[PDB]
Structures are given as C-alpha cells and as structure tokens.
Amino acid sequence: MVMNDANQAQITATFTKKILAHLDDPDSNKLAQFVQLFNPNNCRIIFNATPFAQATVFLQMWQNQVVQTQHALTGVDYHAIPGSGTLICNVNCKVRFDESGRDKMGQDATVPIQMNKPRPLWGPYFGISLQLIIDDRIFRNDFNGVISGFNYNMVYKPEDSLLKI
Amino acid sequence: MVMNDANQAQITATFTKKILAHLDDPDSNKLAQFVQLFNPNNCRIIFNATPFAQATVFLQMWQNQVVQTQHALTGVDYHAIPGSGTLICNVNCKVRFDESGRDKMGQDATVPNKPRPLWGPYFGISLQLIIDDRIFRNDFNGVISGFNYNMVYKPEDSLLKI
Amino acid sequence: SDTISFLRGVLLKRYDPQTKLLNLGALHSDPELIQKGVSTQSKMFPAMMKLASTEKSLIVESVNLADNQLKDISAISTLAQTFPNLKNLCLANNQIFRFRSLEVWKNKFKDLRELLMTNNPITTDKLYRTEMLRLFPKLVVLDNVIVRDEQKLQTVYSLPMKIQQFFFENDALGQSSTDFATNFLNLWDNNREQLLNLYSPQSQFSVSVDSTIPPSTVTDSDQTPAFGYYMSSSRNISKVSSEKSIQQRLSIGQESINSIFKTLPKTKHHLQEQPNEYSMETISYPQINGFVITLHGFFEETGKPELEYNHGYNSTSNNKLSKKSFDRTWVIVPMNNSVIIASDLLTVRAYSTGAWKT
Amino acid sequence: SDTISFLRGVLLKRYDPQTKLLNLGALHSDPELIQKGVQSKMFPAMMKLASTEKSLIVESVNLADNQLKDISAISTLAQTFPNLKNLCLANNQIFRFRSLEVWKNKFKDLRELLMTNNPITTDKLYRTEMLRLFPKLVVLDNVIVRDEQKLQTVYSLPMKIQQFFFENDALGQSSTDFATNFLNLWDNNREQLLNLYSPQSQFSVSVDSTIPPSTVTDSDQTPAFGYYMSSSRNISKVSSEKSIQQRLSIGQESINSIFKTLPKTKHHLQEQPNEYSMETISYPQINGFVITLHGFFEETGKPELENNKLSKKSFDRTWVIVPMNNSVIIASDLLTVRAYSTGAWKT
Amino acid sequence: IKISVRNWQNATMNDLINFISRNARVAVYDAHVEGPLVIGYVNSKAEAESLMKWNGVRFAGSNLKFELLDD
Amino acid sequence: IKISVRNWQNATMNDLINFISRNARVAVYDAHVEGPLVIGYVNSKAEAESLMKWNGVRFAGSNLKFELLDD
Ligand SMILES: [Zn+2]
Ligand SMILES: [Zn+2]
Ligand SMILES: [Zn+2]
Ligand SMILES: [Zn+2]
Ligand SMILES: [Zn+2]
Ligand SMILES: [Zn+2]
Ligand SMILES: [Zn+2]
C-alpha cells in the first residue's frame, strides 16, 4: 500500500532544505559529515549531465572547484514507493553564486603588485532541478547513507551572470 | 561528587543569557563566534522536533531562514552531573519575532538609515542545554553538546507560521 | 425572526462550495432583494455578515463586492469580524476615494493574498500601493499585478520546519521514553514514594516556577495562574534573587527528593487518554552513557500537598488548585533490567495550549 | 540614408573579419572623412549602424587618437559590443574618472585594456578602479593585472553543461523511445497512457510560481498558472496540510481525473530536439529506472473538465518506471510546471 | 519635419519645387539652398511621408533622393 | 423582554436569579441555562432597563454582564 503522510512530507521538505543548506556551507572541515548522508557502497550522482561515481569525489569537486553558493528552495514534491523501501523527490530551486572573484578559501585572482573576512557579492539567479532518491528511514529520523540518488541539473541561466557553465 | 555552588550558578545563568543574546543578534559577523560554542565533532541539536547534526547548518538556517528575534529569559535551572564532566540546563523563555516582513539583512519581499524591527506577540520556549563544566574555568570552545529548542505555546495573532 | 430565513436563502444562492466563493457583488441588482427590501439600506450589510457567520457549513476564501455603490467601507467594515482569514477580495466598480475608512482593517485580514480595486478612484493616489502594502501584510497581488514575491514572503513569515510533537533519534529510545514516561507519570500521580527507587544518592531534582503569563491571544491560556504551593520550592536563578536559598532548593538523595515530592501538589497526568496534549523529545547523552527525555505538557491538580505572607496572603486564590502546564526533563542512565535517574528538572507554568497543536 | 551608406562604407573598410578587429582609431586622419568636411554626433550613429549591420562580429576595437576628453561620445559602444574582449583608448585626453563609471558591470568579457598616454594613468587609484570596472580584465597597459588560470577556474564550473546523460546507450534508445511515445500519446490522446499505470502507481503535479530573471533570454515574465493551481502539490508553497494529502492521485482512475483536470498540450520533441534535456539513471531498489526530462510545451486546449490564460510553459517531468518485458509500467510520475525559459544547456 | 533633397544638381531650384508640388501633392513654403542639397520645411508629417514616397524619381538626367534630419 | 446574563459562573443559577430578585427587585420567570450565559425573559422593557442598570456589579468572584438579545 502507498504511503501518504503530512509528517513525512514536512520531514522531506525540511530535509531537502537541510541538503541545500549543507551545499551552501563553505567551510571545508565539516565536509566529511556531508558525505555521511550519501550511501558509501552504492550511490548515483549527476551534475549537469556529468556523472560522479563516489560522493567523496563529487563533494571534493564542489568544495574545491566551485565558488560559494546560496540555494533557495522554490518547489518540492515526493513519491514514497512501496516495496522499494525508498522515496523519490522532484525538487526545484534557485541558485546564487559568489561572483566576487574569490574562491571558498577567499583567494583573489589578482596578481599582487602592492581577520574580518569580506562579504560575498551574489550574482543573478540560476534555475535548478534536483531529483533525489532517498531511503524511507529519514521518516524514522535516520540520515546515515540515505541518499542513493542525486540528479542536479540547471534548467535556465541568466546571461548577465559572470559564471560560465 | 556533586557540585552546588552559587558562583557556578551565576556563570551558568549569565552564559544562558549570552546564548540567547547570540540568538537575538542579527549581525552576520558575530555568527562566526556563535559556532565556536558548539562541539564540532559531536553535537545534538533540536529545533521544533527537527534535528540538526552539526551546528553550522542550523546556524545558517537560523541566520538566513529565520527573522530577527528577541528573547526574554523567564526561567533557568541547572544540574551539574558528576562523572559526566557536564551540566544540564532547563531553560524557559519568551520570544518576539520581527514581523515587519524584513529578514536580518533588512531585505523586503516587495518588488520595486537602518530600519527598526516590528515585534510580534510573544512565543513560549523551552530550551534544554547540555554544556561542559569547563565554562566554570572560563573555557567556551566547543562546550555545547546538547541543544534542545522547542516551542511550548504560540499566539494566534502572530503572522509567523511554525 | 421570519425575515432572516430569506437572507439565509440569498446567501446560500450566492455561495459556491467548489470555488469557495461568496458573491456579494451588486446586491441592489438582485431582483429577489428589491421586492422584499428597499428606507433601510444600511442595516442589511452587518445583519447579513452576522447571518453569514452564524451559519456553518459555508467556508469562504474569496468574496466579491464589486459594484455595491459604496463611497465608504463602513457598511461592510464588519466583514473583518466575519471572515478574518479571507484570502481573496474584490471591491471593483465602487465609488471609494478616501483612505480613512480602510484604517478599520489594519492588522485584520492577515491572510489576504489578492485585492481588486480596479475601477475605484483610490487607484489614482500615489501612495496607493504603499498604503495597501501597509494595510494587508501578506498581500501578493494587487490589481492583477504582483506586488510581493511569494517565495520571500513565505520564507520570512515561517520557520524552516513545521513543528512536530515527537522526536526520537532511534525507535528504541522512543519506546523506552514512552514506557518510562507513562509509568513514571502514573506513579507520580498516584504514589510519589514508589519513584524513589529510580534515584541514586547522587541523583538530583529541583523545581523551577515560571511566573510568566502567556499572551491572551494564545488559545486557552490561564491569565490568572496560582503558584502558591510551588513558590516555596522554586529554584529559578533568574527570578529568585536569594542566592543562599538556591543552594538549599536543590534536592539530592531519595530523602530530600522525597521531601520535595511531598511538598508538591497531588496530580493526575492524562498521557494515555489525551496523547495529543503532550510533546516529547529524546536524545542521546554519551557523557553519562544515557539518554535525555524532555516532556512538555499539562497536568491536573487533584489534591493539596502532603506537606503544608507578611502583609497580605490569601489561601483561597494563591493556593487554588488548577491545571498547570509543565516542562520536565529526565537525565536517565540505562542498566540491564533497570534505569536510574541521574537528574530530574521540572518547570511549572500557567496552562497554555501546545504550540504543536494543529 | 545618405550619410549612413558612407559611414557603413568606412566601417566595412575599417573592419577586418579574420582578426575580428574594428579599427576606429584616428578618424581625423582618414582622408575620406576629411574629404566630406567632418562631428561629435557621428560616433553614436556609427554605433547604431554597427549594431544594425550584424555582418561584423567584434572581439577587439581600436579607438586610439580620437581626441576624446570623455567616454561620453563613445559610451554607446557598451550597447553595441557588450561582449567585447579588447579595447584601446590610448593617446586620448581622458583625465577624470566620472566618464568610465557608465561602463561598470559592462564589457564583462573585457580581457585587455590600453589607456596609454591618458592622464588617468598617473592617478594612484587607477589600477583599483580599472580592476573594479572590468571584472574579467587580465591585461591593463600591457602588464598582467589578473591571473587567467584562477580567473577562469573561479568564473566557470568544472564541467561544460551537457544536454543528455545516459548510463548505457541502450538506456538512451529506450528512454528516447519511451519519452517520444509517452509524450505523443500525452499530447494527442490522454486516456491510453492509463495502460502504463498500476493500481499502486502514483502521479502528482507541482507548480513552481517562480519568475525567471528578465536577463534570461526568452523568459516569460508574466506566467499564468490558472488551471494548474487547483491540482498543484507543492509542499513548499501550500501550507495547508490536508490538501497536500488530497492532491496526490493513486491508480489509473484518479490519475485519469487529474489528466482530465490539466490543459491539452503539445510537445515538439521530435521537431525541436535541442529544446529538451534528459537524464536517465538506474533504480536498483525497484529494479527499474528513472527518466528526468526538462523542457517546454505549448498549451493548445483548455482542460476537458470545467491567470487562466493559455500560455507556453516550461516543465520538469520525472518517470520512475519498472520494465516488464511485454510492456512497461510507471511506478511514479512527477511533473513540475514553471514559467517558460530557454534551456541553460542551449548555446 | 526637416526635408533634404539631393541629386537635383544641373537643374534650377524653382523648377524642382514646382515639380515636387506637381507630382507629390505637397508644397514646401520656405526652401534654403545650402550648397549641394536642398533644405525645406513641410507643415505636417503626412505630407512628409507622402513626399518621402517619391524617392528615386528621375529628374534632370539623374534620380533625386530625399532624406530627413532624424531617422 | 429577552434577557441574557454572562459572568455568572462560580455560583448556581438559583443564586443569580435570587440575587437579581433581591438587589434589582425584578424577576425572570422562566430562565434557561443554555451553555455559558443564562437566558431568561422579563415582562416589560422598563424592567429590562432597570435590570440593565445593575451591570457592573460584583458577583461570585466576577463582574456580571447583562444584555438584551435582539435575536
Ligand atoms: Zn546534516
Ligand atoms: Zn448597479
Ligand atoms: Zn471582481
Ligand atoms: Zn592624430
Ligand atoms: Zn591600439
Ligand atoms: Zn506547436
Ligand atoms: Zn433557552
């Protein structure tokens, strides 16, 4: 029989928001914990139709080769699939990039010819569609290795953005 | 052996007040210090029965997706537990939210000099804290192990929907 | 008494259940109303509003008042009293030009999303948008143009999570917390003594009184609480200025814990009967190899305590038995067959409906 | 009409296609221009024609020695060649900072700038200002002022976006077939699709009211979700707890009801393959797979049952399908409807 | 409303004005020579567009061309 | 003629009616409980205004509120 519960829905929404917040976190130390959400043995990650075999590699790429971001959840819907022991979530959200010219470390690209960190300047909004395949165990407040499927793709881009995909 | 000391009580109470003050502070700069209070390795956070594994995400969500707040301490009691190396605090307080419709940045939801916040009606809060005894020795780095924050009563006329 | 029955009919005719819309536009045009009524044009509006309110089984999220030939809101000002959670409203084709009247609706219709003032003169005013945005906090669309982003508006007036009554890390702690809670409370109600087996010589217990009175807007709040029996034992560091007492108010060992247990009123907790009236949280406590159980709820005051000012004291009001709301936190250490309470922290406060209620 | 042909001639003569360079330097020296007699009003006209001609693609411009005291006369350049990479303003009389302020956040792709012999070069704040005004500036006065490597890495993602991802080519073929067939049937006759749904299979629709930024090419700033709002299952927007429970449809019957509740549409997938993006992944837990398809569709007809304006829409649809060798069954179908906007994968 | 005419050279101004007033059903009241191209003002825009229709008409061994101050 | 009374709680109806009959020297002959507020009928309007005079009076730990119901 099919599972339909408002509690589960709120859990899903807030968890999704938590995932996006986790993405938005620039500090490199805590990264190790983020990886805890993804299944270590078998996980399927996709970013702009480019795959990632292991969550570690994907988050390393995110931490190293991507500027600080700010996500904003616009929409989320989910279907809990009986017998699968899992649920699938169709998510839509907005994204802002730190277009300061500074990496997560805060290092500028300016060649030098010369403790309060400066604030990032947020660029135009990007459109994102994120598909999540998660274990139902999150309904039992268990989040260890629950994310099996992660499909993140850009649906529309603003031209005036300094970011080039 | 069990500790019962007035000095420790004053430290505890004032620290609680400091935590609430930290919560109420909208300035983004100071946030960096706030995260210092929580243990990075192992921490248990709860907000309206919704868990948080690590303090950073919680504090980011608090900074971004919650409006400026004003806490008013109504009650505090604490037990220093021997052998645990920790103390547990049962706290109760009232809360007012900025119902101006502006976030901590002061950004409106309207489509087109610092502004004053419009305080909504009071909310009831029960807060349980697990802290290290080290605060009695003037150490506040990673002292917060337990943070259980829940609303006990809400005013109907508030525009905030929990 | 006879007249009202007709108006009831007219409303039912003007209400659509599927669209949840009440079409109160152009009453002067309705032929049914002209033969029966009009020099009484002023007395019909509020009467109809009251009659709309009294009759259940009609839920309105949208109301149309286009073309009612109103120069002023007065005749319909009472609408705010009838459908305070109204989401859509149309006042088009009317002769309203001034803002003074609308001031009646400030801090009312807080859930209003759309407003249509298309053919009303006020549309000319420069401060129109600003004033309207002032008057209706959650307004998204005004005259069919978007004046507020639903996204931000939603994020601002809501927390990241909808409140839930229960949180358990793992199901074991859930079952354990439930069992412990129900049993402990039943014993706490009927026989305080039995609980003493759960406290060690190092175990501690204290009570903190929150004298604070909740806002009147809070549903079913106790605006005049009475903490007579508790105030003597209160260990509230913020409130009680006496520093010497606070040391004493803490009870260690089964003896002092029992003494304070006898000092407190005799109660009854309906955990099994009224489960919706309680919220609980349970988390791991690694430093003690145990758990923390926090319970928020209410309890009824059945009997005066087993145990027991300068100018004026009255036992009748201050010591009146009444239901109280409470926050109790047990720090517990598990053993194979048994459990030991490392710490028990109670908060007693005026009764108030749970924030977790829906 | 008379002047423009001549100026057009001068431009065409002064443009080189191979180097993609427009040499508007030293116009006063050109005998053709002096022959006529020419003076301030000429630049913007030339710019207007430069935009109008469209047979000139410019990555470099020379404006050396035009006796310009201020950028004002040539400001329109920013409107004409916004994607300009190289600019030379040497041997000119520019001395104050006011003029260049028009060009902040413009010429975002400007790499080289030459202000040689211009007085501003003396000022201490020169470097700072130039670096501020032109975000991606690499070379300024023939010296490197920004590291290209870092600059490139920062303002771009590790991977170029791709329109398609398939685990296996076979999954590609199958997914394409499924998409085309399902969508054609979805367009022309809604009922038949019910053959693909089991009694436990579920379908719901979620409306994303978000309006794309105006800067997005061909975005619909005024969307209309009249017909969808009634069936929308957006947990983020709709706070109502019971409705969300109700919005979900299980079984071919209720699925048919919602299929009837939605407007009649048409997907030009085969006609315009570049306007769609698709991803297909394995779903081991159900021994099936997931197809996520992002695109757009036109609204041909009002819903068969009972803001409300018909308009082109963008969509994100996700099918969880479990293969059965004879035919396939959709375990789950998740649709998202949003305002039209060109694909980010587009070029 | 400012009218310019070129390729009238080798022929007289008055004849040109009358010729235009004949063919184009529009008259220019005050016309200035100004070197190679004739300048004139017409009362209304309708006459200006009507006048602009007669562009490239053969006149005195060449084809006249008409233009306006602002495109 | 139709009388409604609120804030009569903490005392019995009989006490309320007798209290009114004592102090205001006017009686409601048939008085119905009807949930939170007491309903009764008094013979005349004069008795109703006279009864309405006794509005801010203290009664059983509270202050009575009287109303003449149009319903
Ligand atoms: Zn986390
Ligand atoms: Zn009329
Ligand atoms: Zn209307
Ligand atoms: Zn020169
Ligand atoms: Zn040059
Ligand atoms: Zn078409
Ligand atoms: Zn009655």
Residue numbers in the entry:
A (entry chain C): 8 to 121, 134 to 184
B (entry chain L): 8 to 119, 135 to 184
C (entry chain K): 101 to 138, 143 to 412, 428 to 477
D (entry chain B): 101 to 138, 145 to 412, 437 to 477
E (entry chain A), F (entry chain J): 23 to 93
Copied sentences from the primary study:
Although extensive trials failed to yield crystals of full-length Mex67:Mtr2, diffraction quality crystals were obtained for a construct in which the UBA domain had been deleted (Mex67ΔUBA:Mtr2). These crystals had P21 symmetry and diffracted to 3.3 Å resolution using synchrotron radiation. Although it had previously been unclear whether S. cerevisiae Mex67 contained an RRM domain because the N-terminal region is ∼100 residues shorter when compared to metazoan homologues, the crystal structure clearly shows that a RRM domain is present, even though the sequence similarity is low (14% sequence identity over 70 residues when structurally aligned to H. sapiens NXF1RRM using the DaliLite server). Strikingly, all four copies of the Mex67ΔUBA:Mtr2 complex in the asymmetric unit showed a conserved spatial arrangement of the LRR domain relative to the NTF2L domain. A dense network of interactions was observed between the region linking the LRR and NTF2L domains (the LRR-NTF2L linker) and specific regions of Mtr2. However, in the present crystal structure, an additional interface was observed that was formed by regions outside the NTF2-like core and which buried 1208 Å2 between Mex67 and Mtr2. In contrast to the defined spatial orientation of the LRR domain and the NTF2L:Mtr2 region, the position taken up by the RRM domain relative to the LRR domain appeared to be dictated primarily by lattice contacts and so, although a spatial arrangement between the RRM domain and the LRR domain was observed in the NXF1RRM-LRR:CTE-B RNA structure, this appears to have been primarily a result of the RRM and LRR domains being bound to the structured CTE-B RNA. The electrostatic potential calculations of Mex67ΔUBA:Mtr2 indicated that one side of the molecule was more positively charged than the other.
The Mex67:Mtr2 complex (TAP:p15 or NXF1:NXT1 in metazoans) is the principal mRNA export factor in Saccharomyces cerevisiae. Mex67 and TAP/NXF1 are modular proteins that contain four structural domains: an N-terminal RNA recognition motif (RRM), a leucine rich repeat (LRR) domain, a nuclear transport factor 2-like domain (NTF2L) and an ubiquitin-associated domain (UBA). Mtr2/p15/NXT1 is a 15∼20 kDa protein that also has an NTF2-like fold and binds to the NTF2L domain of Mex67 (2,3). In yeast, the Mex67:Mtr2 complex is thought to mediate the export of bulk mRNA through direct interactions with both the mRNA cargo and nuclear pore proteins that contain characteristic phenylalanine-glycine repeating sequence motifs (FG-nucleoporins or ‘FG-nups’).
